[PDB]
Structure formats: C-alpha cells, structure tokens
Amino acid sequence: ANLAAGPTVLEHFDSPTYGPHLLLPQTGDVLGYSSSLISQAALLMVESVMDALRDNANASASTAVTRLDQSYHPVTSFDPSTFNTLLQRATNLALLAVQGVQSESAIPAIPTMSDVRSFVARLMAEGDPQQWFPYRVDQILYWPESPFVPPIGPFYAPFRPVNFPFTTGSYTVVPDASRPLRLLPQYRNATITVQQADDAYEDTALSPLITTHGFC
Amino acid sequence: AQRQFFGLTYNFYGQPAPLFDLNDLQELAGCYARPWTSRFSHLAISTGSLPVWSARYPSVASRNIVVNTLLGAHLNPFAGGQITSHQGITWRDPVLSSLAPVPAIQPPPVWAVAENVLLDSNNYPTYVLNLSSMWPINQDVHIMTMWALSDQGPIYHLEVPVDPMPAATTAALMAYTGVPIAHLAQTAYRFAGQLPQSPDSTMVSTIRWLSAIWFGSLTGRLNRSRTCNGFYFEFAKPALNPDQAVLKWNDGARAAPPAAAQSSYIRCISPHWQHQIVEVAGALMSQSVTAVTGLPALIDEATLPAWSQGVANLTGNGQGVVPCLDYNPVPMAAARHLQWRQDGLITAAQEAQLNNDYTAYALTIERHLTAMLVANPIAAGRMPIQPFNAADFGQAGQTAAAVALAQAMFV
Amino acid sequence: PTGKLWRPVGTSVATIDSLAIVSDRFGQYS
Amino acid sequence: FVNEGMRETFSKALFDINMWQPLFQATKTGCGPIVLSSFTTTTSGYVGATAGDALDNPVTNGVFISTVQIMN
Amino acid sequence: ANGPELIIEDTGLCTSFMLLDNIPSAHLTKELIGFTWFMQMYQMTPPLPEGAVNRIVCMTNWASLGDEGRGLEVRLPPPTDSSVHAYKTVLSRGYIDNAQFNPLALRSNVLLMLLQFTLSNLKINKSSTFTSDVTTITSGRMIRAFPELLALAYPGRAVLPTQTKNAQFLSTAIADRIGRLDRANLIGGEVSAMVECMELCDALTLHIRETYIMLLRSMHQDPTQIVQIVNECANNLLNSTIPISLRPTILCPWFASSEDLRLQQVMHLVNISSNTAAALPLVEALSTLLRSVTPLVLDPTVLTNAITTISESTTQTISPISEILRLLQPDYAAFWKCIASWAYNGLVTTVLSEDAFPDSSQSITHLPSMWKCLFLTLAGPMTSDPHSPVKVFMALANLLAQPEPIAIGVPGMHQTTPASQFSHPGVWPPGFLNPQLINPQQAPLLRAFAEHIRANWPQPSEFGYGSTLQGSANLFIPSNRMVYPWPNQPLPRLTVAPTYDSAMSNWISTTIAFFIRVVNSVNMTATVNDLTRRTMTGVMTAMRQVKTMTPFYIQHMCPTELSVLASVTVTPPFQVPFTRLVQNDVITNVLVARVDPAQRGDAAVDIRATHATFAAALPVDPAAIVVAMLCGQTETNLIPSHHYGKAFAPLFASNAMFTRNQRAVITREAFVCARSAVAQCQDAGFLVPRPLDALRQFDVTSAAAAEIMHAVNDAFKTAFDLDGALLDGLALYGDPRIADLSAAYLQYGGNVVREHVPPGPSHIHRALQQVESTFMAEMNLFNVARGNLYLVQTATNGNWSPMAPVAAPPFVRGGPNVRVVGRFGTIVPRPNGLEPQLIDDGNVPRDIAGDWVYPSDVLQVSVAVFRDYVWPMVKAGRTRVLVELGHYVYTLHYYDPQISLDEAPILEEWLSKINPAGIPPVPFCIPIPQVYPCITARRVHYAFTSENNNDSLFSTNAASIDTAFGENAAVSPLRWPGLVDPNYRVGTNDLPNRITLYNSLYRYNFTYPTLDGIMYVR
Amino acid sequence: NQPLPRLTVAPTYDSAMSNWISTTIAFFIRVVNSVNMTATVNDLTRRTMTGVMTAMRQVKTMTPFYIQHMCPTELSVLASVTVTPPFQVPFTRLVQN
Amino acid sequence: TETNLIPSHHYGKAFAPLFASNAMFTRNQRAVITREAFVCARSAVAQCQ
Amino acid sequence: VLDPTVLTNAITTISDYAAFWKCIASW
C-alpha cells in the first residue's frame, strides 16, 4: 500500500530466501540486453523467469531444491491486460513457467549477455500471450495435474485450465550437432492442397539462394 | 491494510432479472456521484425523520435492500473479469467510480442476467492494484454479501477478546456517549469506507466493541446495571417508539470478562428487522467491522437460505464455522425485559406490561411491512420490502440461543 | 451451428481449450 | 450459394466427424476440427439459376462455397 | 477565516408552514351576537388562526426565534396576495413583466426556489429549557417554555371557552401528546444530550433539519481520532494529549472524506489560471513557509572560503579562482523554490534558466563556460523539469561539439543547437538514451558524460504525509503519499553532521569527479595551460570536499518538512510521478477537464485536445542552486526532530487545518446540487432522478444552465457565506449543461492515466430531492395549483368553489365534440353574417360556439384574438373553454356572497396581462364563508379549476360556532396525526404526501469544542 | 442542415461545423506538439499552445448549431422576401471534375 | 443566443416586418416587364439585321 | 448573437462580424 507509487514490486512467492522479501527495482533501465532500454524492473523478471525455465529444464525427482520455482512476480504498478512492456510479456510467461514448462532452446548455466539478449529478443517477438493461466496479484494458479507442489501459505491456488496441452516428463540434454543433420521424411495424415502448400513455401523459402558447386 | 474480499449477490426471489428499477439506479447510484459509501446517507436519528413510510421506498431499510440489488447487476467484474453493462448502464471507468449510460461506439458486453453470482476481489487484477482508491467498493460488496447470504435479516458478527477494553477504546467510546445507535453505525460505516485501514487500527477495536455492547443490551445482560467496561445501551421506553438506542457509560457492576473467545454470527430473523432503524444501524454497524478484516471465519450453514450453501469463502459446514443464531425482536425484547426485571432494574409487575407496551409496538411495525409488501408486489420487478409471507413475524427463531450467547459473552 | 453449447470456463478469452460444455442443473443446452 | 438447409447437411456431416476428435489426436491423423466456415466465403450479388431469375434474389454478404472449395 | 458557517442552532420550534389566518372573521356586535367567539375577549391568544379563511401558507422559519439567521429564506405571501415575485429567481429578471410569472420556465424556478427552501432550513434543532406545568392546563407536564411563541407551539394547551370550530378540533388532542418525552442525559448535572419532544413542526422541515445532523456527522471524529489525525499530520513529533474521560457530547465537523477532498482539489485547479503566474503564489507559498521553519542555514563564506584557499600563481591571465568566484554568485530563493516546486510538479515544473547555459559561441577551451557548464550539472537534479537530464547532457555535449560528435535525432536540431532548446521528449540524443551508441574513439569525454548522468541521476521515492483517517487531496499518487526526486530517509532524533553518503552528496561527488576528468583530458591538456589546469582540479576538489550539511538535509529533514508542511499549506500538494530518466514516461501534459468528453462526442478524440494543460514553469538559476546545495550548515548542537517539534507547534495547534476540510464538504454539496439543478431543468442528463418532470421548461439553452447553475452557486454562497470561489470556474467554457470533473496526465510514450473525480455521495442530493418529491404532492401550500383551468359561464347562487370542484369537470380534452385550437390560434373571418371560424387543431377552421381546449402556449401568442372573438362568446354562455396550462401560480380573491358580483372583469384584466412572454397568476374569485344562512346575490363566475387545488384551506371558520353558507372546512385531522390520532405512534410520518404540522423530534444540546477543547497541545 | 431540434446537449455538439471546428483543433494540437516543433518552440510555450488551441475547441460556441439548424430556416425565408432572388450554382466537396 | 429564446416567437417577430414590405411582388412585376422589354428588344434588333 | 466575451475569458486565462455574415449571405 505504502510503496504503490514505485514502478513495480517483484516478490518471491515460493519459499523466499530469508523470509518473505519484497524487491523494489529502481526506476532506471539497463543498457545492453535490448536495443530498447529494458527497465530494471522488467529485467529482473527476465533474469528470474530465465531460471524457472533453465531450472525446470534439469530439475529432477531425486533432487530437493530450495524453491519449487525461481520466477519473480509483479505485485504493484503492473498492467495485467496488455502485453507490450517486456515486463508484462515476461510476467505472462512466468505464470506458465511455474508449471514446469521448459524452453526448447537450452538456457545456458551461466547466462551471458549475448544469451540473455537472445532470450529478451525472443520474448519481444510478436506472439500469443499464453492464456491457460490467468494472472492474479496475490496468487499464482498452478495446475493440479502438474509436478509443482505448492509451498504452504496463501499464495498458490490450484487452478485448472479447461484444456492444458502439456503433459509431464523431462528431456535429457544432447550436444550441438557438428554438421547439418539429414532427416528422413516420414509422413502424417492431413495433407495440404498444392495451392496452399505452395505459397506456404513461397512465403518462407530462400528463393535467390546462393549455392556452392563443389566437385561432381 | 486488507486486500481480499469475497461477495455473493442477492437472490432474484423466484423472479427473472435483478429486482431493482431504472428509477432506482438514478435514485441511489445516480447523479453520477460515487454510489459507494452512500448507504448511510438515508438514515436519521430515528425513523420518524425519514421518508421510510408510504412512498417509493416504504421502509427504514428499504433503501439498502434496493441499493444492494442494484449492486448485484453491476458487479460482473468480480464475477468474471470484464466490466459489462446491465440495461444501458455500466461503470464509466475501470475503477468503477460510478454508473453511467453505455457509451455509444465502444459499449461494454451486455451483462449476463444471472442470480447469486459469487465474487472474488481477485477476479479483477486492477482492484488490488489500486486498492486505496476503490477501497470503498470492498466494504460495500461486503455489506451486500452480509444481507445476501441471508433472506430475512442481515447476518453480522460478534466478538469479545478475553482482555479488557483496549484503553484507547474506552476513550474513543466515552466520546460517543449521548450519540444514538444510528449515528454510531454512522461513524462506524463512514469509517471503514475510505482509505484501507489496517485491522490493527484503533477504530476497528472500538467500533467492534461497540457492536458487542449493542448486542449485550439488545438481550438485557449489558443493561443499565450490568455494563460492559462501563457502557450499555438504554432503549427508549416502549410506548413512544422503543426502536431507539443510545450509548451510556454508567458505573454499575462491570460484567466480568468471558472465560474465552466468544464468536457467533447473529442475524435478525423476523421481517421486523426491515423497519427497525436500530435493528439495522446495529447490524449494519457490526458489518462495518467485518468489512475491514476479511471475515472472522465461515458463517455456519445450518440455519440459512437455500442459495447460501457452502458459499465458497463465506458459508461453511465443517470446523471453520461458527454457529449462526437468529433472534426475533419480540421474543427477544421479552427476555430483554425479563433480564431487567431480574436485576431489579424494574418492578415484577412492570415487565408483564413493558412487553405489552413493546409487543403492541412490534404489531405496528408489522401491519405496516405487510401493507407495503402487499403494496409493492415483487412481480413488479422491484424489491423495496423483500417478500416474507405473513408468518416469520411470530417465528420464534434461535432467540433463546442468542440470549444465552449474550451471557457467556458478558459473564 | 449445431451440437451442445459451450462457454469459456476460464472466462473472457475463449481459446478452443477454455470452452467446456455449459452443463448444469438442467442438463446440457443443445 | 449455400442456402440455410444445405448448411445443415455439411454441418451435420462435419459434426459427425468432429465427434471423433479424441481419436484423431491420439493417432496423429486428422488435422484439427473441420469447421464448415473454412470452405465458404462472404460474397454478395444476385443468386439464381439463370440471369433472368437470379435478378430477383439480391443477396448481400451471403455465404457461398466456390467450386474448388465444393471440392475439398 | 472563510470556513462555511456549519453549526447554526435554532431554539424556536422548527416549522415552515404557518397557519396564516387570512380573511378575518368579521367582529360583529349589532346583530347575530355569539355566533363567532374570539380568544381575544379572554385575553388569551388562539392556538390556531381564527378567520373566515385560514390558508396554510409556507414561510421558512416563520416561528424561528432561535438565535442567528441562515441568511436566505422563502416566504410566499397568502394567495390573497400576488406571489409571482417569489418564482422569478431565473429566466425572468429582465424579460417577463412584474405582474406575470414565466410559465415556460416554471420548473426551473419552482426547483431553484425549493433548493432555496432547503438551505434556509439547514439549522440544527437546539434544545431549550423544558419546565414543568404548575398550571392545571397540563397538570405538571414538560412543555417547553419559550414569549408568545408558546401558545403557537403546543396547540394542545389551548383553553376552549365555547364550541368554536377550532375548539371543535383541538377538543380532540390526546392529553399526553404534549411537552417532551425522553430527555436522554448522561453526566448527572451536565446539560442533557438530546431531549425528545412532540411540538408543532412539519414532518418536512423536520426531515431536512435532521438530514443535516446526519451530515454534520458524516464529517465528525471522536477525540482519540482527531488526535492521531493531528499527530500523523506532523509526523508524531509535536506533543499533544487527549484526556481519557467521558466527554458528554461533542459534534465537531472538521473532517471531509478523501473523496469530498479531491472534488475540491480539482475544483480548485479549475479556477487557478493554467498560466505560470497563478502557480507562482502556489510555490512561493510553500517556499516562504519552507524557510519559515528549517534547520538549514545557507552560508556562502563556507564555499567562498574553501575555494579562496586553493593556490593560484598570479603570473597567469585567466584566473581559475576569480572565475567561479564570479559565476557562482547571481538569491537562495532559487534553492528553496526548487524544493517547494517538487510539491506541485503537477502544476509547475522548475527549469534551468535558459540564460544560465554556456553560450553556443564558445567551445570548452573557454574557461568561463567550463564553470558555467559544471554548475548546470550539479544543479541538474534539483529542478523538477522532465528534461534536466537531456538539457544537462546537451549543455556540455553542445559546448564540446568540435571534438565530440554525437547522434542528434530530429532535423533542425544540430549538436550545436543552444542546449536549452531541447525541451521535447522525442529529441533526446540517440546516444544519450543508449550510451552504448556513442563511440569512445570519437566522443570519449561526451560518452563518459552520458554514461555518468544515467548512472547517477537521483532515484525518485515516495513517503507518507497527512492522516489516513482524514483522506487526502491526491489525484495521481496514492492517498497520503508524495513522490520525491531524491532517495528518502526517516528523520533522525539524534545529532546530525554533514555526511558524504546519500544520492545528493554522491551526485555532487561523482559529477565533480567527471569535470575533474574533463579538465585532465586530452583536449583540455593540450590547449589550456598547465599550472592553471591544476588550480581547476583544486578548485573542484575543494567543492567536492566541503562539509556541506545540505546533501544530508535534502534526504533526511527535507522530507519531514514537506510532509508536515503539506498540511499547513493553503493548497494541498498536487503531484505526478517523478520519472528518473525513463524516455517514455516523461509527462508532457498534466491535464484537467471542466466538461466531460462524454456528452460532447469526444469519447475517442485524444486527451491532449479534450482537457486543459497546466502550463506554468519557473526559471531556476544554477548559480543559486549550487551555492546553496553545496553550502548548507546547521546548528552544531541540533536535534532534527526537536527543532521541528518546535517549528511546527504553532501551525498545528489551531484547527485552521481543519477549515479547508469543510470548504471541501460545502464544495462537494454545491456541486452535486448544481449538477442536479441543471440536469433537472435540463432534459435527461447525468442520471438525476427528476421528481419534477410534470412542471414545464422550454429553455434548455446553455444560458438557461449558467443562469440555473448560477443561482445555486449563490444560494450556497449565501447560505454558508464564503467569499472564496466555489462552484465557479465550472462555467468558464460557458456551459453548465455538461459540468464534469476529471484530471489526467499523459506520458510521451502513450499511457494517458485519467482519473475523473466524481462527486462523493452527498447529503443534499437527498434533502432537496426529498423536498421535490413532497413539493409535487403539496403544491398548493406554495401557491401553485395543478390541473387545468376552465372558463364556463356558471352563474350560480350556492357555494361556488373554484378550488376544490365538486363533480366531474365538464368536457375533458378529446371528449365528444371538443375541438382543440390549432397551434397558431388564428381566427378566419366569414362574409355576410357568418360566424368567425376559429382554426382548430387539425387545421380546419371550426366555429366558436362549442367546447374548446386551449393549449396554453397558443393562448399566449393569441390573446389579442381570444379576447375579441372567443371571449365575447364565453360570456354569452355558449362556449365553455378549457385553458390547458400545466401548473400555474394562483391568486385568490374572496368576495362577499351577500352583495352581488360579476367575476368577469377580474378575468378580462388577467387576459389583458398575458404576453407571448408571460401570464399573470390565474385569479379565482371565492365567496367568504359566512356564519349564518344569509340570502345571496346571483354572481356570475367563469374561472374554476378541474384538479382539486384546494389543499391549503386549513380551516373554514376558526372562531365561528359553525359556518353556514361558506364551505365548512373543519381543521383536517389528517394533518395532525401526532396531535389527535389514537393509533398514531411517536416516530411515523407520511413524509411524501402530507405534511404533519405536529410531530415528535429530537432537539440536541451539542457542544462545539475547539482544537483545545479536544487535545491539549503545547 | 436539419429541422430545428429542441435545444439540448446533443444538437449543439453534433453539428457538421462542431465536428469540423473540433477535429481540426484536435489535429493542430498534435502539430504544435510535433518533434519538429522543438527546433523553435519552447517546452513551456509548446504547452501554452496546446493550452490555447484546446480552449477554442472546448469553448461552448452556439453558432455551429445555428449554422446547421437555424440558419437554413432564415435563408429559406430571407430568400423569398428579396426583390432579387438568389442565384446559386451547385456546391461540390472534393468531387474534382 | 439570448437567454430566453422560443425560436417560434423570435423568427416570427423578425419575419413580420419583412412580409409587410411588398418587396416580394415588386420582383414579380419588374420581372414581367423585363420579359416584355426583352421579347421586344431582341425583336427590334433582330429585325434590323 | 456573436460575442467573444466567453471565448476571451477561456483563452485569456492561459495566455460587428461582417466577415461571417458576408459569408452566409455569400452562399
């Protein structure tokens, strides 16, 4: 109530560190992560959301972690409806990152500016703000049918979307392919119509593609 | 402060849409001013000073019972999430400051006429983000939900910490002595209806103790003789309108503190409540407390209407519940007198008359509600009187139970 | 249209997954 | 033109297919639910059997299905 | 002291409808003696009026001896009188002639006058001295002794010698229904809180008069409250104590809700001229006070000294020392205002004074510009201006162009553009936002500057101010909060010593570290001499090492002062979030709105074009800032808190702070009434329940609004008496019709906020309303018959009764063969002896000998005709006409049935006074009711109303033992339920239909303690 | 033009001219706020410009209503009581050729 | 516009003086003579060529 | 009746019409 004028107030709902804290980012914004100066408030979100994601990535059953998730959470001066500010977009993605979802693109153990920027870039790219889990100011709705087990207090409601597409299980990390890997083509059932399956190609194909000849 | 309230809308008593006229929306929520903390600007020092008889709203409680219905139709945000609009009317802005005719080019999706919709101060992510500003809408939805969970008389709450009155709570009351029950709920209501006050704030204790003493008086116990910390309410002698109540710090034996935490939900049970300025200013006041403190616990389910079962966050049934008692003004007052009669307060031959005096009074605030009831049907899309069927009037509800809950509350 | 009527159980935004057969005390409205 | 009743059929036909939705995903065949609103359009003009009689059916933003669509 | 005169006790019995005895009973002695008795012969004044006709006319406070007037009242003169003068409070003044009353704007007046009827009744019912009754009339009872007003109060105490029509009635009066009932007293021996008593008083005045006590409450607070509201207000420092002991009763209306407040804060910003001049007596007000109390002594010598002591060879021409010593010298008015300006950034944001920028003709080899530019920086954060950062960046970026080139956005803005000219948000150096962009190998120095400003511009922060129990005047910040440029620390209760930590201090230390780098840089090092360049490093280090106590102050004690001083101030702080260098959140405009963009189709149109934009900027000077900032000393032995607990004592001991708190409430009223007043007289606007829709109104033009909306602003200005501009300004754009408040800023990016303060839930938007519900019901009591007016030549001999008409009215509209008059009302003449056809409604001339229905308006632009063709007809008794006018004013004229009379001329004259403008109050002749059965002369009458407009007759022959020819009208018991009904219950009143001239009512004894009446401060 | 409607808040802000006077002032308010303006327009004076142009826009002028409801009824009449009738070639808005 | 304003009465009073001056008929008269002076002028000059 | 009084006030804070009539009579 008293610090409601401040830009935004992030707070760790899952087992805070030394007791419930209430992080308040100063107004300034960092230089480097995005061509558009990202507000210190929103940057903290990315840095954490980029944890709950990288942590989900390798969190295992046998291990016991401090917090069942590392994602931050906006509690004040935050626009819940729109999806412009990097913060809103990040927040929107953290309500999902608390379910155990993992990024297809492996998030490095020691995030580097090049990497953080490649994530803050992927976040800005026009897309669809996840809608399964609506946002609240004092509660993080977590899927009942999800690995995440709520701490204790009154911060986690067991909300269940009408149709969440994710199932559980993990993924063992595989090293970077040293050369372009060929892919045998196995077909599905639905088939596209030549007309549509043409421009579809011609809308994303590399037409005047420069190519080497080598030796025949 | 406090950022969490759960409400429940009125019940369209076997009727279609919400029982409130357009003529009403521009009679309470109109003028464009914020229809919020206005509930109280329709009450006087008593009843003889209000247009609460033969008229558009024939009742000392016919206002709130209407404004409450009107609130149901315009609270969709807390129901789902969007603002919506009921019959060319929708809040002007996201802060729900007031009502106003639907814009013209960007109209809100027409509301969905549904009865008894639950509410969550969370389903509206903007509410808490502004808390301070639209603070009022909280305490109000609360006043609503305490009349909605009931059908025949609002359901407030009572307390009594095992400790002595919080000093700065005996000082705050001793400056409200002569003041009538009406102007007490006034300060009470007016207070917990602007700027989120911490439940720790002095006033809450004071106004919460003023709702515990009022009850002790309403059941003899806390009388002119056996006062609380020094207070008790003196009711006007029935013969000239006993529907009064004034706080009076005396100095007679102090009703010793209870042996434990005494909590219970009490609601007026007979239609009588609808016209007793004291049975409303009191109940309404006891609700001022709950509004700025969440809700003690879950109100017992047992004795309660059919549309109030397991009402998430509100009603209960298990352990987190508190037995809810309901008294009847007459079966009540009778014992309220017997108490006085036992404490030598009055003669042994004066209580068999005090009842006559008061009982005839209740028979007057009875041929009047029935008249207004069979005057303002209900199929007329309105509910200034709220149906009650000529029966509940005599209905000797819990009563006997609350008369005991009063003693244990002020031993 | 045809079939039973559905409504956004998750409210407002209907995502093709939010929708659920609007059943109730009367059965399902078809 | 796709007169009111003729939509009842193609809807009743597609309706009986959508029903099998849970088995289409399970077995990775299919391709999502088939909405009849994916084969039609919202053109407008006069719709009849011959210039002469089509002149008495000015329809605005009616729902027509093009030949190549009536094929899919 | 201009605070609304709220508490206004009234002892005399509250009633506003006196039974004014009209046509007196003839004292007759020659003949028929005994028929009529006068209480006068028994030297004893009659309780009820005694005359041949006793009307119940309305006079607010007629019997109000209670000390002190309210200022304005409404006393209609009996129907026998004219009356119209009481209804021309608007749309009349200089247009509709005396004789008449503007029938077109009738509602606009009967409403503007009812508002008048209410405010006049806004007094508290003070309790009097109830003494017993040693006399046998009430044998002991508690009647309230008053002079002669007694007789008039309790009608029951009347002594009846003979069965006089009054005594016929009074006779009934339930014995026990007199005096008082329940004196509820607490402190034994102290005056009773509120006694309760039945005593002649109308349910209506009573209602208003008590919906006022309800109001004085809506703005009251027990002692344990008003103490904290006061404590918190001075931040708990300031010793005030309340005595824990029962204080009988204390109605002290000092508080207004937070909402009632804001409605007057925006309201106050409307009258304030958006110009910089109107915001100057807003900052300077906070600045004279800021200094008035402040442990911060400014002391030049300190700085001068610290600088004078740097060695400087005099075998040099440029005098590094002599320079700043000059520059740094233009007084402290600038430091304070910078601060004071923070309190009202919304209205006015300070700015670096254009003149104090190194001029754009020199590069950085110029040493007077190197110092000029250093002083721009330091003083940078001080000014509230949303650009100081960019302007500071340019100032240098600008001055060192030749060496350092940087990106400069828009065309016509080169890096050498006179710094100051960088006010728009969109024109910030691309490099300045993101320093990543500025390359070192090209603009090192400048890049380290951009790099610096970003890393060290003060982080804004907010603190509390005022009491949470007493709302606050915030429009863009949470209640009881003030955004603030510098990081903030809690006031210290120990000993202070200039510390070198803190945003302020650090900002001076890093920036002075930057210009020490500018001086030891390549450029500088090659040009500027050597030994001189050392002097400059010394002249700066000295500064960046002076023990200035200010850095501390701007972070510890200043916040306390602004907080505590944000209450004593005669205008609450008006702030908008401070944006520490955030490109998009730069506030280009802080706007307000007099009208709402809803009514005029402006829902979509941009904000910058629908609201006014405060444009007030102060030219602060960098010289002053620095000299101060960098040179504050205190009293070595000083307790910050102590020095304040002292400096606030006065401006917190009196309840002057509580005054504005009411000017707010009266504003929230005046506004809600106007909104109602205009919208009622208007036609369907802000959903305002119009209980006066039947009455007329054909002037809905703005003028009509301003006129309406104006009187209302008087009625209050007169009622509460307050010179201060209230409800004014709303007009400005000449149009009350759409009065609507709204404030709202706009950050460069897009975000528009908006925050339209709506009137709080007010207490008179009830009362007045409540009066109009009841006015409608009982018009007659104000001289305003309803229904229509018939004109038929009935020449009777019996009890003619114009007002209450027995039987069905002859020929209603649309009856068999009852043609209306076509709009124009024209009469076409016909040749050789044929009746002149009267163009009927359907537009087909019909003939005068019949039954006509005259739409009043028609009759106004047509009388010249009416009187010449239809009138000669009505007299002949061959053309009953119904003049159809909504609600008219009605003059009565009692004649004597004995003598003969022909009501034609008292009608023909009335006709000759009807312009296309206004008609005179319809006059009805009425025989004076006789006592005996007299022989009567056949009189000829014409005017007689259809609706029963005989509602104020009250009595027919008070003194007479019985009326014989007149219409007996025994005092209706329905009027005095309290006084004569067995079933009546003390506390019931059909308030929206009849007006019980005798109810029960609680009279209080409120004591109004002052601030020393509550707590004991000092 | 339109038949003289009973004066109210509606016809007096919806006139053709009210729209024109409005949307124009609206348009120029964004012009005096252009980034380009900065070159010579002061930040304070740029606000003072929005201050004045908004006064005009919001001013409650009653001519826009006259020139669209009451002015036709004058010319219609006045155009008959004149010894020399009105010569009038058709009006055209942007239809060029 | 003037505070009190009944469009009906106003325009009425104004257009009253206008129809009092028979300037509407002068137009019809000067007209039938110009048509005479024309069918006669055009003819006389068309008869000399 | 044309009169800039209102306009002047409104503007002045934050700071015969032949032309007009010879524009309608011009149409």
CB atoms within 10 A of CB E355: 11
Amino acid present at E521: S
Residue E648 corresponds to which tokens in the numbers above?
A: 């606030």
Closest by CA to B289, choosing from B211, B349, B367, B404, is: B211
CB contact, 8 Å: E460 with chain A?
Answer: yes
Q: Return the H-helix or E-strand segment holding F14.
A: none
Q: Is E7 helix (H, G, I), strand (E, B) or coil?
A: coil
Best interface-test mutation with G: which of F12, F78, F83, F84 has the largest number of G CBs within 10 A? F83
- Set of chain A residues whose Cβ sits within 8 Å of the Cβ of B3: 137-138
Residue of E nearest to A25 (CA): E459
| Shortest distance, CA F48 to any CA of chain H (angstroms) | 7
The answer to whether the CB atoms of A138 and B125 lie below 8 A apart is no
Angle in degrees, 0-180, between the axes of helices E660-681 and E764-777, rounded to the nearest 10: 40
Distance between alpha carbon E968 and the CA centroid of its chain, in Å?
49
Closest by CA to E740, choosing from B92, B67, F19, B24, is: B92
CB contact, 8 Å: E753 with chain B?
Answer: no
The answer to whether the CB atoms of C17 and A161 lie below 8 A apart is yes
3-state per-residue secondary structure call for A79-120 = CCCCCCCHHHHHHHHHHHHCCCCCCCCCCCCCCCHHHHHHHH
C-alpha–C-alpha distance, residues A95 and A109, integer Å: 22
Question: What residue spans in chain B does CATH classification 1.10.287.1520 cover?
Answer: 328-380
End-to-end alpha-carbon separation of chain B, Å? Answer: 33
- Set of chain B residues whose Cβ sits within 8 Å of the Cβ of C11: 80-81, 123
Do the bridges between strand B321-322 and strand E941-945 make them parallel or antiparallel, or are there none, so unpaired?
unpaired
Residue of E nearest to B240 (CA): E986
Name the CATH architecture for the domain at B328-380.
Orthogonal Bundle (1.10)
The answer to whether the CB atoms of C15 and A131 lie below 8 A apart is yes
The answer to whether the CB atoms of F55 and H11 lie below 8 A apart is yes
The answer to whether the CB atoms of A188 and D29 lie below 8 A apart is yes
Residue E960 phi/psi, 5-degree rounding, is -55, 140
End-to-end alpha-carbon separation of chain F, Å? Answer: 25
CB contact, 8 Å: F82 with chain G?
Answer: yes
Q: Are the C-beta atoms of residues F44 and E617 closer than 8 Å to each other?
A: yes
Touch test H–E: 3 Cβ pairs or more under 8 Å: yes
Q: Are the C-beta atoms of residues B136 and B127 closer than 8 Å to each other?
A: no
Touch test F–E: 3 Cβ pairs or more under 8 Å: yes
Touch test H–F: 3 Cβ pairs or more under 8 Å: yes
The answer to whether the CB atoms of F81 and G19 lie below 8 A apart is yes
- Set of chain C residues whose Cβ sits within 8 Å of the Cβ of D11: 1-2
Reported resolution in A? Answer: 3.3
Best interface-test mutation with G: which of E90, E109, E698 has the largest number of G CBs within 10 A? E698
Q: Is E201 helix (H, G, I), strand (E, B) or coil?
A: coil
Residue E225 corresponds to which tokens in the numbers above?
A: 């409250």
3-state per-residue secondary structure call for E42-87 = HCCCCCCCCECCEEEECECCCCCCCCCCCCCCCECCCCCCCCHHHH
Residue of G nearest to E702 (CA): G3
Q: Are the C-beta atoms of residues E351 and E615 closer than 8 Å to each other?
A: no
Residue of A nearest to D32 (CA): A190
| Shortest distance, CA E510 to any CA of chain A (angstroms) | 18
Question: Quick one: DSSP state of residue E704?
Answer: H
H and E: helices and strands count for chain B: 13, 8
Q: Are the C-beta atoms of residues B315 and B301 closer than 8 Å to each other?
A: yes
Q: Which of A76, A77, A139 sits opposite B122 (nearest CB)?
A: A139
Closest by CA to B155, choosing from B11, B324, B10, B42, is: B324
CB contact, 8 Å: B206 with chain E?
Answer: yes
C-alpha–C-alpha distance, residues B7 and B147, integer Å: 10
Residue of E nearest to H9 (CA): E732
Q: How far is CA B341 from CA A78, A122, B237, B410, H10, in A?
A: 62, 81, 14, 18, 73
Q: Are the C-beta atoms of residues F11 and F69 closer than 8 Å to each other?
A: yes
CB atoms within 10 A of CB E608: 21
Cβ contacts below 8 Å, chain E against chain F, sum to 113
C-alpha–C-alpha distance, residues A65 and A179, integer Å: 37
Q: How far is CA E592 from CA E596, E730, E753, in A?
A: 10, 11, 12
- Render E406-465 in DSSP notation, one character per residue: ----SSS--TTS-GGG--STT-S-HHHH-TTSS-TTT-HHHHHHHHHHHHHS---EEEE-
Residue of A nearest to B123 (CA): A136
Q: Which burial class, exposed, middle or buried, applies to E840 when counting CB atoms under 10 A from its CB (0-12, 13-18, 19+)?
A: middle
Q: Show which subunits contact H, needing at least 3 CB pairs below 8 angstroms.
A: E, F
CB contact, 8 Å: E602 with chain F?
Answer: yes
Q: Are the C-beta atoms of residues A13 and A140 closer than 8 Å to each other?
A: yes
Q: Show which subunits contact A, needing at least 3 CB pairs below 8 angstroms.
A: B, C, D, E
C-alpha–C-alpha distance, residues E94 and A104, integer Å: 84
CB contact, 8 Å: G33 with chain F?
Answer: no
How was this structure determined? It was done by cryo-EM
- Set of chain E residues whose Cβ sits within 8 Å of the Cβ of B44: 207, 210-211, 214
CB contact, 8 Å: F19 with chain H?
Answer: no
Residue E997 corresponds to which tokens in the numbers above?
A: 């001239």
Q: Which burial class, exposed, middle or buried, applies to E943 when counting CB atoms under 10 A from its CB (0-12, 13-18, 19+)?
A: buried
Residue E420 corresponds to which tokens in the numbers above?
A: 């100051």
Q: Are the C-beta atoms of residues E1000 and E197 closer than 8 Å to each other?
A: yes
Question: Quick one: DSSP state of residue B101?
Answer: B
CB contact, 8 Å: D39 with chain A?
Answer: no
CB atoms within 10 A of CB G49: 4
Q: Interior CA angle at E832 toward E831 and E835, to 5°?
A: 65
C-alpha–C-alpha distance, residues E611 and E475, integer Å: 15
Cβ contacts below 8 Å, chain F against chain G, sum to 25
C-alpha–C-alpha distance, residues E895 and E929, integer Å: 9
The answer to whether the CB atoms of G26 and F83 lie below 8 A apart is yes
Q: Which of H6, H9, H14 sits opposite E274 (nearest CB)?
A: H14
Q: Which of B81, B122, B131 sits opposite A1 (nearest CB)?
A: B131
Q: Which of H2, H6, H11 sits opposite F52 (nearest CB)?
A: H11
Question: To 10 degrees, the CA torsion angle through E664, E670, E676, E681?
Answer: -160
| Shortest distance, CA H26 to any CA of chain F (angstroms) | 10
C-alpha–C-alpha distance, residues B152 and B305, integer Å: 9
The answer to whether the CB atoms of F26 and E600 lie below 8 A apart is no
Closest by CA to A7, choosing from B124, D9, E505, E747, is: E747
H and E: helices and strands count for chain A: 4, 4
C-alpha–C-alpha distance, residues E510 and E544, integer Å: 9
Q: Which of B49, B194, B246 sits opposite E471 (nearest CB)?
A: B194
| Shortest distance, CA D29 to any CA of chain A (angstroms) | 4
Q: Are the C-beta atoms of residues E658 and E1015 closer than 8 Å to each other?
A: no
Task: Please identify which residue in the block is written with the tokens 């969905």.
Answer: B112
Q: Return the H-helix or E-strand segment holding E775.
A: helix E764-777
- Set of chain G residues whose Cβ sits within 8 Å of the Cβ of E102: 4
The answer to whether the CB atoms of F38 and E427 lie below 8 A apart is yes
Q: Considering only residues 117 to 156 of chain B, which have any Cβ-Cβ distance to chain C shorter than 8 Å?
A: 123
Q: Is E242 helix (H, G, I), strand (E, B) or coil?
A: coil
CB contact, 8 Å: B202 with chain E?
Answer: yes
